Design a protein around this ligand. Structure first.
Ligand SMILES: [Cl-]
Ligand SMILES: [Cl-]
Lengths: 285, 285
């Protein structure tokens, strides 16, 4: 049978793991959250532990859904890359630089492993339904080996290039929009509040008009409900928009709006809202 | 029967007129475009001319879908307000200040006419299907008189307040999002181009990911196709974001992103792209 290990059981990771289970793949999970692991076991997983060292040696594919490159490197190099069998594939689905994706791929290739630069999007709901959007780049060997996984976790896979790096570049550009949209939504709702317009009313209008955005609809519900419990933290976009900034600077390209959004999220973090839901950026107002 | 006159047969206006015709209302149209008028006549309109002076005296309701307050005032005060019969209603669906909506309403009330501060949104496609989103405020008399029209042209009507002004305030906030989203989309696509990512590919990814926006999906298709033929001009947002700026300043409220977008559209206009599609803001890059 096909064995796939999912490392990182956050909202996106759990969705992927459940989608793999529905697809009938032998699924293993790894996360420091004992409750995420227990749920997966209760749902049919072959195994679930704090790390993937217990099953890395038998999986045909390992999917890594973590926050940053540092965490990807920690999972791979108590690392598990050296335990993986020749020909197995590693699908890196985080938000890293093109350089890091290439550096990581080179290290894995040396171990006769295939890597797919495959950052994802689509939201937690879509993920739970196996309807992720994947922006991937990598060898034919990686794409072929991971087909069972991609078919299970995703509904839209975009093959950007045949070499690691391009996928992460696309993800970076995508995060520019995600970040700016959250900040713009916050700016508009704070103005609405200041103008005396009920936020629930403002929310309904926008979500039924031409000014709507996926991020407005998703994040501004948190604002209307006054629930800043972190789904995705402010600090995530401080990091992501920082990566966007670096990419643009390397290309000598100006970012009027992305630089502004980065400053807004950065202000929200210095104000102490760094670990709160990213919609908390509205608090700088 | 119920007679309704539609003044301003642009994309939104034609949709409203056709929706009124489908609803079985006696429909009249007014626009300087002889081709818009001819099409309406061919479709069953009672009349269609350059101005509404020919039918203003018999309509139960007059809908004004124009670009700005100046044009609303020109239609009302060769004006037609004084020709309208007592009890008739005027639905102003433009993008004007709250002050202007109130000033215009007062003038119409003095003539025993009802006015509805009813700016709209939803896009041309929705408009043609009678599925507009209306953010309206005004008296019970105005809402009641216009019900036949609202039922025909709209699918979502939000009654903001019982007095003219609030509707326009909501529209202003909405335009902040519409404007920022177009500019953010342009910024992201220009960066994508600079980074060497095919725009059609970047478009497909975004429109299937969490960074999508109604404006990105609508306007960036123009960019992918390289067609800057004006559907809605750059100068429209120079005007609209200018109104947003004034609203915020009056409230002593800062707009990091909206002020940036205004500067971008303003730059695009000074560069000579003012009359081109608003997606042409991408040309400042
Ligand atoms: Cl699927
Ligand atoms: Cl309708």
């Amino acid at each position: 049978d096909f064995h796939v290990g999912i490392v990182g059981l956050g909202s996106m990771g759990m969705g992927a793991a459940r989608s793999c289970l529905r697809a009938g793949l032998s699924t293993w999970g790894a996360d420091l959250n004992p409750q995420a692991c227990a749920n997966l076991l209760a749902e049919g997983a072959c195994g679930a532990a704090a790390s993937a060292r217990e099953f890395a040696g038998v999986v045909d594919a390992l999917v890594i859904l973590v926050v940053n490159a540092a965490q990807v490197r920690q999972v791979l190099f108590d690392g598990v890359a050296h335990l993986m069998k020749p020909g197995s594939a590693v699908m890196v689905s985080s938000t890293i630089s093109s350089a890091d994706a290439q550096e990581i791929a080179a290290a894995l290739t040396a171990l006769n492993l295939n890597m797919l630069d495959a950052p994802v999007s689509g939201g937690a709901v879509k993920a739970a339904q196996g309807e992720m959007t994947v922006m991937a780049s990598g060898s034919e060997a990686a794409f072929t080996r991971l087909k069972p996984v991609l078919d299970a976790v995703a509904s839209n896979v975009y093959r950007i290039s045949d070499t690691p790096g391009a996928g992460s570049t696309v993800k970076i550009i995508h995060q520019l929009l995600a970040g700016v949209h959250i900040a713009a939504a916050a700016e508009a709702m704070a103005l609405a509040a200041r103008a005396g317009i009920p936020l629930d009313v403002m929310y309904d209008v926008v979500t039924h008009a031409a000014g709507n955005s996926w991020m407005f609809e998703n994040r501004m519900q948190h604002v209307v409900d006054g629930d800043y419990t972190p789904r995705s933290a402010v600090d995530i976009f401080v990091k992501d928009l920082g990566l966007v900034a670096d990419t643009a600077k390397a290309l000598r390209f100006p970012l009027p709006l992305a630089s502004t959004a980065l400053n807004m999220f950065t202000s929200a973090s210095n104000a102490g809202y760094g670990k709160e839901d990213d919609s908390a950026v509205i608090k700088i107002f």
